[PDB]
Design a protein around this nucleic acid. Structure first.
Ligand code: ZN
Ligand code: ZN
Length: 922
DNA sequence: AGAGTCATAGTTACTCCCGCCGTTTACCCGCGCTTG
DNA sequence: CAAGCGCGGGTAAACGGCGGGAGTAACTATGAC
RNA sequence: GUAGAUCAGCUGAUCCAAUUUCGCCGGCCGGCGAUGAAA
């Protein structure tokens, strides 16, 4: 009987039909569930607004009633008789009376600075005065870009290609210069707002200790000045402080040091026009360093509002996203009105009046010196614009707040405070007895309210205060999410028809199915459900870009996975989806590295030291990250944060996170905090192929060629290194996994050794690779001999000594200042403990005596104790032996960079042996 | 030295019906100011 | 001074929120084969 | 024909290879600056 009219399914019971409707047909059923609005209950915010307006009207007039109140409130949406009826309530007049009563009220430092200024000025003066070819040019550009500022290259490669900007200088100068030039006409703040907000240590001379404690990310690009971070680092700190104090006294920076070159960055990976970029400014390095100190000082001096959780000593994005999710979940669960309006200010930093800013700083309480410095800096400030390579015409800026400066996000925090103080005192959401009203991150404002009139009043208040400040509200992204519960039917419903106005301009009302992004996280009207995870496209982009395999691996390690880490941590992802995603990652990495499909799982994801590829496993890393980030929510200083942490939704999320992490981790011994690194480590060494890698952990330097020194080796040899390191060479034994139904020809050596053909056998024991082994030994001994000579010693390679026992061939003998060392070199299979092999090699040299005295006499020193036994022992997979490492770095002094390279030689020699075997396979 | 699709249970996000008391406001009833 | 209009008390008859109860379509993990 | 090689039908595509362009100091040859995305 019961049959749907859109999916054409007949269900046994009306319950089935309705539940099917709620999923298969969201929009139409949501419209059907819109409640009638005959006699809506009087929410508290309506009562507060009514009482306040009645009180002010009585104070200015003396008498009031519904007739004039209606005129006072045009958009209240209550009938002239409904208002009169509500007027009869006693607590209402009590609040009216309460509000009425409330209304009843050295030469060298200057020399070096001048040298830097002259160099910058000379640079400024100099500056002012086919498909195959396309791909080659792109390769050159990408390599040069990645060599200098990695983040730029990663963002370009993952997102789009072909220059990125793609819009040239035109379409920017025509679209931005007029805005950057126009002077704002903000009248300033009203005295009412100043009073509402009303609810010295700065400028002191900077000291050496504070600047030293002032951290700096030296991995930064220089500005138009041309002063690179290297020389600035080279300057001693005390002279830095001298110049900083000199500037403090002068209250200004040298003219040329303020000039900045504007650059554009896309808000969206696929910009549709010139207006979707952020015209950031890169000031000179010394100016940024100088302003960081004041940024920290002002951060410590006057903290922002409690609701302000942007650029502070806390993860504002996490708290805001969690709070929004908790609010939405609570509203859905108990069917309570909640209007959430996401607000953004287009040209946010580039729309604030200079005069309003400086005067507000004056009234707020900063010292006159600081306000005057800001005013002077922004009065004569000027900028240059340059996209791609175009020193455009310089521009004089009429609106301040310079994106990229350390002070700008803090100075704008004053305006943020002012506007945050303007919303009505009693509008918000009562989330677990806590009133939450606004969630601010930088400029992105999210206003919450429990009533339509309350939300409209809040919107109008923020609009007018911004207009007074000079800011203008964007209608492109601003939207209002509204949920009206349906009591007597227990149905959640969303409004559709637009009803909110920013200064007469209607807003876009987000429907139920729409997806909108907040802080870069996808949000649905029902809460964070999932991320579309366009990972296939990103992997295709990375694979198609002109990069060597290690470049792609590093990008996937450090820039792609973290980017979607936020979407997944703040989203709701089922571990099956995570497994599919990590399988996709594994397949892509196997393609890039040309590995087969039988390589052990753990190899990809085990951390660098344990010998893995350090490619983060989403399936396990994500639960760990969400547990770590949501554990501290209960202990956050913010009261609303603690209230959210007690929400049912977050509790369930954390429970599932704990279960997953418990399943994919082992408790650490020392810190007792579960770690995923241990899980992959255990799996890798237990694997048949990785069994020989069990010694990597004890020697961190054994694997330095995977991540730090990956730039000194070509792509091809890196791929070969990875192939042999995990034993990916398709030998017959390794080629018969599951196909051992054949005869001995399927397992014997081709060369005729008649023994089992193991990759170790091919690399070490087969006679055909005899000369290969010798040349590998010669190469490694030559390298270590050259380095050890470079460490001020004596060299006599392969001393020909005929001892009583017979003919013995030591690797190298050494002698310095009367002390000599007998160093032996050899490579050994990893199937046995490397240190026992080291001891076995050392016994037959250091425990003979007669050869010890022979080498002592040859070197010319009589005492035998000065001669010591040592063995350079490295497994053919390139894994170090701990005891050998220690003795080599301690008994004889060698810097670690030299020791970092021995595994490279061992690995290259082993693969050369393999390829030689295959070459003379005949 | 391998990388199981598939059967079944658990679950989540809903559904709907019935009934309960509390809440809101369209009528109704006047009084005071204005105009004929 | 009387009729009319705007300003004010009262009433009750439906809305509205929530409790209680009885199911299920569409995923999402494994326990075992 | 490709910086080189390879597979195709002088053109295309893949690679384990692939530093483009402008200005300069200079003698087709050497060196320099740009070709730098926030906190
Ligand atoms: Zn249907
Ligand atoms: Zn053999």
């Amino acid at each position: 009987g019961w049959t749907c009219q859109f999916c054409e399914r007949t269900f046994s019971t009306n319950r089935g039909l309705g539940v099917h409707k709620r999923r298969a047909h969201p929009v139409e059923t949501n419209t059907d569930a819109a409640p009638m609005m005959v006699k809506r209950r009087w929410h508290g915010e309506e009562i507060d607004l009514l009482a306040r307006t009645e009180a002010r009207l009585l104070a200015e007039r003396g008498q009031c009633s519904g007739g004039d109140l209606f005129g006072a409130l045009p958009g209240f949406g209550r009938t002239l008789e409904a208002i009169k009826g509500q007027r009869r309530r006693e607590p209402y007049r009590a609040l009216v009376q309460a509000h009425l009563a409330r209304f009843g009220s050295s030469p060298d430092a200057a020399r070096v600075l001048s040298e830097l200024l002259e160099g910058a000025g000379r640079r400024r003066a100099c500056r002012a005065m086919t498909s195959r070819q396309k791909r080659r040019a792109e390769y050159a550009r990408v390599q040069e870009l990645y060599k200098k500022c990695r983040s730029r290259a990663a963002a370009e490669v993952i997102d789009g290609a072909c220059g990125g900007v793609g819009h040239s200088l035109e379409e920017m100068e025509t679209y931005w210069r007029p805005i950057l030039e126009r002077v704002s006409d903000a009248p300033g703040p009203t005295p009412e707002a100043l009073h509402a907000l009303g609810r010295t240590q700065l400028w002191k001379p900077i000291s050496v200790e504070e600047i030293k404690a002032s951290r700096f990310d030296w991995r930064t690009s220089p500005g138009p000045d041309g002063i690179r971070s290297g020389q600035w680092r080279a300057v001693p700190v005390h002279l830095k402080a001298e110049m900083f104090n000199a500037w403090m006294a002068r209250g200004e920076i040298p003219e040329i040091l303020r000039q900045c070159r504007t650059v554009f960055v896309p808000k969206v990976e696929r910009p549709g026009g010139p207006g979707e970029y952020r015209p950031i400014s890169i000031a000179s390095i010394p100016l940024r360093h100088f302003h960081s100190i004041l940024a920290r000082r002002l951060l410590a001096c006057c903290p922002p509002d409690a609701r302000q959780r942007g650029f502070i000593c806390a993860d504002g994005t996490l708290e805001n996203s969690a709070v929004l999710d908790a609010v939405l979940g609570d509203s859905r669960k108990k069917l309570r009105e909640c209007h959430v309006a996401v607000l953004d200010f287009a040209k946010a930093f580039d729309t604030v009046s200079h005069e309003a800013l400086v005067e507000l700083l004056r009234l707020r309480g900063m010292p006159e010196q600081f306000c005057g410095y800001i005013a002077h800096l922004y009065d004569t400030a000027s900028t240059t614009l340059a996209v791609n390579n175009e020193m455009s015409s310089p521009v004089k800026v009429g609106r301040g707040v310079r994106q990229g400066d350390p002070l700008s996000p803090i100075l704008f925090n004053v305006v943020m405070d002012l506007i945050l103080a303007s919303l009505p005192e009693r509008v918000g959401y009562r989330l677990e007895m806590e009133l939450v009203s606004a969630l601010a991150y930088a400029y992105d404002l999210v206003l919450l309210a429990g009533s339509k009139v309350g939300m409209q009043e809040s919107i109008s208040a923020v609009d007018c205060v911004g207009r007074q400040m000079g800011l203008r509200l964007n209608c492109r992204k601003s939207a209002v999410l509204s949920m009206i519960p349906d009591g007597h039917r227990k149905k959640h419903h969303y409004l559709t028809e637009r009803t909110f106005n920013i200064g007469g301009k209607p807003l876009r009302q987000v429907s139920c199915v729409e997806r909108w992004r907040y802080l870069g996280v996808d949000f649905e009207a029902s809460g964070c459900v999932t991320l579309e995870h366009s990972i296939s496209s990103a992997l295709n982009n990375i694979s198609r870009a002109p990069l060597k395999p290690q470049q792609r691996l590093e990008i996937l390690r450090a820039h792609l996975i973290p980017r979607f880490q936020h979407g997944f941590v703040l989203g709701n992802i089922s571990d099956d989806r995570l497994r599919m995603l990590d399988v996709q990652i594994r397949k892509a990495v196997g393609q890039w590295l040309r590995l087969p499909a039988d390589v052990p799982k753990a190899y990809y994801h085990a951390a660098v030291q344990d010998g893995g590829l350090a490619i983060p496993s989403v399936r396990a890393t994500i639960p760990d990250l969400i547990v770590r980030r949501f554990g501290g929510l209960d202990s956050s200083p913010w009261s609303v944060a603690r209230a959210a942490a007690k929400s049912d939704k977050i509790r369930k999320k954390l429970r599932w996170a704990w279960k997953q992490l418990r399943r994919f981790s082992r408790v650490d011994s020392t810190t007792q905090r579960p770690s995923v690194r241990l899980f992959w480590r255990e799996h890798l060494h237990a694997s048949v192929d990785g069994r020989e890698l069990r010694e990597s952990t004890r020697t961190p330097t054994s694997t330095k060629w995977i991540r730090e020194r990956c730039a000194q080796i070509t792509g091809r040899d890196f791929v070969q290194f990875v192939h042999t390191h995990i034993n990916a060479l398709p030998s017959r034994i390794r080629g018969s996994r599951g196909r051992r139904g054949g005869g001995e020809s399927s397992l014997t050596c081709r060369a005729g050794c008649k023994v089992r053909e193991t990759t170790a056998h091919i690399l070490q024991q087969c006679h055909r690779t005899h000369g290969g082994r010798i040349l590998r030994h010669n190469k490694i001994v030559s390298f270590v001999a050259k380095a050890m000579e470079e460490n001020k010693w004596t060299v006599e390679l392969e001393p020909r000594l005929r001892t009583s026992v017979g003919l013995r061939k030591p690797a190298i003998i050494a002698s310095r200042d009367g002390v000599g060392v007998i160093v032996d070199v050899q490579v050994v299979s990893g199937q046995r403990s490397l240190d026992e092999l080291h001891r076995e090699k050392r016994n037959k040299y250091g425990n003979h005596g007669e050869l010890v005295e022979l080498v002592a006499g040859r070197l010319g020193l009589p005492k035998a104790e000065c001669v010591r036994a040592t063995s350079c022992t490295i497994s053919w997979r390139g894994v170090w032996s701990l005891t050998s490492y220690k003795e080599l770095r301690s008994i004889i002094g060698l810097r670690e960079p030299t020791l970092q390279i021995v595994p490279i030689l061992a690995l290259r020699g082993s693969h050369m042996n393999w390829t030689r075997f295959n070459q003379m396979t005949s």
